[PDB]
Design a protein around this ligand. Structure first.
Ligand code: 4FL
Length: 167
């Protein structure tokens, strides 16, 4: 049993809910929240800006030190950093940004990072301001992630379309 409430079950391991991922994390304090990161961990807007704002910029301060030591992530890669006031840990995952011309085949690699964690609260990778088709992102999630993932879809309209169209 876990703390996640009000999710629709899509598969054995994937659950979905209409919610702002920032609002959720504060209530549940999950072991892992996933950030929709970029390779520079520059959390300016979208999921990353909203998560970072909720940490009072502490996520950005920690991220800048990480990049100064380790250099940029890979597209499709990830790192584990603090969850600050939102979660125990934040898994920063880089999905391909279609609005930068990145290979959408990298979306599966991105979701493979989730399999290193037994339970996660996450957004749909490469969705929102990353520009991918969220219906596609949900299909790759279901076909790639084997661990227990609780997805948050910010747009009520999009949430209803994701559920209604789910095979
Ligand atoms: C994009 C933005 C957000 C967000 N939460 C609060 C303000 N903006 C959440 C998910 N995707």
């Amino acid at each position: 049993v876990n703390s996640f409430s009000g999710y629709l079950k899509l598969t054995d391991n994937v659950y979905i809910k209409n919610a702002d991922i920032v609002e959720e994390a504060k209530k549940v304090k999950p072991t892992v929240v996933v950030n929709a990161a970029n390779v520079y961990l520059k959390h300016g807007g979208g999921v990353a800006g909203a998560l970072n704002k909720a940490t009072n910029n502490a996520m950005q301060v920690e991220s800048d030190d990480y990049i100064a030591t380790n250099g940029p992530l890979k597209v499709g890669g990830s790192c584990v950093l603090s969850g600050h006031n939102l979660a125990k840990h934040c898994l920063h995952v880089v999905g391909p940004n279609v609005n930068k011309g990145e290979d959408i085949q990298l979306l599966k690699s991105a979701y493979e990072n989730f399999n290193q964690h037994e339970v996660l609260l996450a957004p749909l990778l490469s969705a929102g301001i990353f520009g991918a088709d969220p219906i596609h992102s949900l299909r790759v999630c279901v076909d790639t992630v084997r661990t227990n993932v609780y997805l948050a879809v910010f747009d009520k309209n999009l949430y209803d379309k994701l559920v209604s169209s789910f095979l």
